[PDB]
Amino acid sequence: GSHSMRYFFTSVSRPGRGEPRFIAVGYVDDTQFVRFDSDAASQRMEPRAPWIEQEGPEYWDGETRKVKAHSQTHRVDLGTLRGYYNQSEAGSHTVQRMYGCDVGSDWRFLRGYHQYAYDGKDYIALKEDLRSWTAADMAAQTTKHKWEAAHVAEQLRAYLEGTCVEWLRRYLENGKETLQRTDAPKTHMTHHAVSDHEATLRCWALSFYPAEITLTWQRDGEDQTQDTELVETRPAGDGTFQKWAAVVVPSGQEQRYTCHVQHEGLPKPLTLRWE
């Protein structure tokens, strides 16, 4: 199917506690292979996946070199964005940045992106055409005009359509055993008495990859969207994911209910039922 590479940059000012914290993470689809914590010992870009570990000195040197530059860019920004909003130099604030690229089945460029947030809100971001910007407010327009002037978008388009997809394609090869896999959910249902007329029938999906999954409950075919408790898809810690969905069933009606699982890695969707 299709694939994506994304980098996540978080910069947090710490007035009275030295320089801002800077963390960076890299993903291909739902797997990470890069990472960097300004606070760590190495002061290096480090590997977080087995298939990236033997890239070489050049790669590691290149990435480390650039990530340090990213960190410095964000140090400046935190100061600039204080003034923009006439903020007191006491408060700790956050800058977030995400960008990456997608390819399709044919592994050709599909779409690129690049957004930016101050204190948890859309600040400024590149549009789908990769030629223009969309500012969230008054402050951000100034930034818009700056980057428009400096032809910044044109360079992001070049990276996104080139280096970005190029290395995504290279990693998909490097880690083809990890990244080109389809771990089908292993599924089952649990039943637990709440009272003397109510039971707990929560469905389970375990050890699947990628994260994208759909768990739904039904009564007599009817969807119980509003009556289902659904958890966020969660990391197993081993590179797989988990999710469950529970409904309450007036004891005696269990057979009215079915759970439905849809995932890339299943031939067909599953129709469980506490028959």
Binding site: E63, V67, H70, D77, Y116, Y123, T163
Partner: peptide, 5 residues
């Protein structure tokens, strides 16, 4: 590889 207000 990463990009080289």
């Amino acid at each position: 590889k990463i990009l080289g207000v």
